[PDB]
Design a protein around this ligand. Structure first.
Ligand SMILES: *[C@@H]1O[C@H](CO)[C@@H](O[C@@H]2O[C@H](CO)[C@@H](O[C@@H]3O[C@H](CO)[C@@H](O)[C@H](O)[C@@H]3O)[C@H](O)[C@H]2NC(C)=O)[C@H](O)[C@H]1NC(C)=O
Ligand code: NAG
Ligand code: NAG
Lengths: 466, 48
């Protein structure tokens, strides 16, 4: 029940899960794998660590055999009940422990996939208990530090483009790849290659923190391997660009070197914090004169509609250093407990609408947009389950990641499978004219899927042609 | 090595799951009356 990395001598302790009552891994719709760690389960027959539903069909006997395999702590349950296939073959289960510094509800044993032939069950458990190092994800570009922490996929991974839905690659750029369904990407892998004929192969494992190019200011990130090439070890490198915009970008493939892999990612997070041209003012040559929005840059505002208490600050951080839930966020949807940004204050853009004679302020690149079910009905946070409140898509008694569509599941049993959006939250303010409103108040104009919020602010400032 | 009773039923949903499964010779003849592999079992999974 204890394994050490031969290189570092790091002690791993998994004894905080040694409960004989154990835990329940989820398969199918109402499927139950009663399982335990380091010890035998109680629902299963004596000696058996993991079993099946109505009948106690064993998928391996319980042992302490713990292995360190490339950042992962594998547990092997061998010698179960005989499986169909051929003579002598019994069931077995490989329960892996992958590093995940971010604590939460998805810290449970999941069933990622199964191999039919060898009668082997692949298991993945993502806990901070299986973590040696910290989350090295930030590098220094002079005096200002650049971080890649927002780009961490924490539900699954990034699907790669069909170079020449059927995927090809799966990518995670700091922490190891999160366990998906039916796709057996070896637990701990960062970059995964899935061929049409043949199982997924490990073409990427997280090496070190991102490196910096001195000349044209590019950032690179290396991902080595644990399996050999067809000319010798595999390798995969990801190059980063600076592409400002609404999209946060997605790792695309460019060069398929026979033993190497080149991925080119265009993202605004690999861009510096650009200081605004003319402070906090608007200048278009159509009118030629300027609008001084610095008068509104005085303090915080609380615009609220339908329980949703927003925080808006023109040219100022939404929530100040006191509460500070939404760092960098120019608009912050408060919950008092969490908080979610609707655009980094630094990404502020000012434009002139000629249709309505208005001034458009917009921030971009906040937090990840809310997940929806596969049907199209948005999820509802927070929701109750057995007596607990939940903030994101979870995996209790179900295979794929699921959410509730009501305020309470226990009460209404309404749900669907999550399909996450690869877009980030945006927020815009359309400044409209009013002469008697010296220092006016913004109001919620339109909320779209919680992925975009537009405010209408009526002020005296955006007027004078007198 | 026969696979009969509820021990065939529990194995069906373990392979088929949300896809569902049928029972149509039949599957009881192929895996319970005789011995089959899990490939001759997933042939009886309902089309995704
Ligand atoms: C656009 O509007 C802003 C805000 O009105 C202008 O900046 C502001 O300029 C005034 C000058 O009267 C500053 O007021 C001064 O404050 C100090 C205290 O720090 C006080 O001792 C003085 O008596 C005076 O009242 C004001 O602080 C400053 N804005 C802020 C809030 O920092 C700005 O100049 C205008 N844009 C242009 C055309 O440059
Ligand atoms: C690093 O900082 C310089 C500041 O001059 C900037 O020009 C460059 O774009 C930055 N490089 C990146 C993309 O991190
Ligand atoms: C790749 O090479 C390293 C040593 O450089 C070795 O530790 C690792 O096991 C190799 N991967 C394979 C082919 O298992």
């Amino acid at each position: 029940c204890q394994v050490t990395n031969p290189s570092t001598g790091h002690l791993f302790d998994l004894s905080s899960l040694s409960g004989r009552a154990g835990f329940t891994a989820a398969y199918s719709e109402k499927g139950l794998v009663y399982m335990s760690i380091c010890g035998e389960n109680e629902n299963c027959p004596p000696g058996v660590g993991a079993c099946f539903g109505q009948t106690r069909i064993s998928v391996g006997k319980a042992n302490k055999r713990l292995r360190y395999v490339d950042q992962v702590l594998q547990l092997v349950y061998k010698d179960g009940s005989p499986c169909p296939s051929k003579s002598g073959l019994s069931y077995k289960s490989v329960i892996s422990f992958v590093c995940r510094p971010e604590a939460g509800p998805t810290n449970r044993p999941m069933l990622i996939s199964l191999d039919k032939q060898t009668c082997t069950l692949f298991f993945s458990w993502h806990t901070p208990l299986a973590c040696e190092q910290a989350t090295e994800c930030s590098v220094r570009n002079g005096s200002s530090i650049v971080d890649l922490s927002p780009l961490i996929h924490r539900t699954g991974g990034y699907e790669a483009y069909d170079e020449s839905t059927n995927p090809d690659f799966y990518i995670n750029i700091c922490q190891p790849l999160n366990p998906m369904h039916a796709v057996p990407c070896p637990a701990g892998a960062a970059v995964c290659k899935v061929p049409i004929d043949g199982p997924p192969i490990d073409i990427g494992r997280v090496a070190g923190p991102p490196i910096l190019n001195p000349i044209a200011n590019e950032i690179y990130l290396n991902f080595e391997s644990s399996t050999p090439c067809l000319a010798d070890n595999y390798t995969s490198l990801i190059a980063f660009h600076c592409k400002r915009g609404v999209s946060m970008g997605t790792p695309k493939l460019l060069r398929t070197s026979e033993c190497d892999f080149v991925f080119e990612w265009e993202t605004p997070v690999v861009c510096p914090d650009e200081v605004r041209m003319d402070g906090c003012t608007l200048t278009d040559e159509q009118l030629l004169y300027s609008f001084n929005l610095s008068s509104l840059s005085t303090s915080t505002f609380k615009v609220t509609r339908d329980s949703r208490t927003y925080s808006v600050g023109v040219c100022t951080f939404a929530v100040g250093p006191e509460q500070g839930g939404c760092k960098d966020g120019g608009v912050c949807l408060l919950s008092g407990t969490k908080g979610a940004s609707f655009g980094r204050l630094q990404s502020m853009k000012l434009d002139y609408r000629h249709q309505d004679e208005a001034v458009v302020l917009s921030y971009v690149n906040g937090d990840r947009c809310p997940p929806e079910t596969d049907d199209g009905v948005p999820c509802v946070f927070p929701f109750i389950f057995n007596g607990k409140s939940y903030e994101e898509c979870i995996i209790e008694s179900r295979a794929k990641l699921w959410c509730s569509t009501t305020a309470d599941y226990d009460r209404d049993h309404e749900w669907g499978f999550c399909r996450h959006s690869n877009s980030y939250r945006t927020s815009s303010i359309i400044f409209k004219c009013d002469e008697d409103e010296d220092i006016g108040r913004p109001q919620v104009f339109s909320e779209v899927r919680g992925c975009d919020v537009t405010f209408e602010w009526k002020t005296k400032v955006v007027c004078p042609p007198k | 090595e026969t696979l009969c009773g509820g021990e065939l039923v529990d194995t069906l949903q373990f392979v088929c799951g949300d896809r569902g499964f049928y029972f149509s010779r039949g599957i009881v003849e192929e895996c319970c009356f005789r011995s089959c592999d899990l490939a001759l079992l997933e042939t009886y999974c309902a089309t995704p």
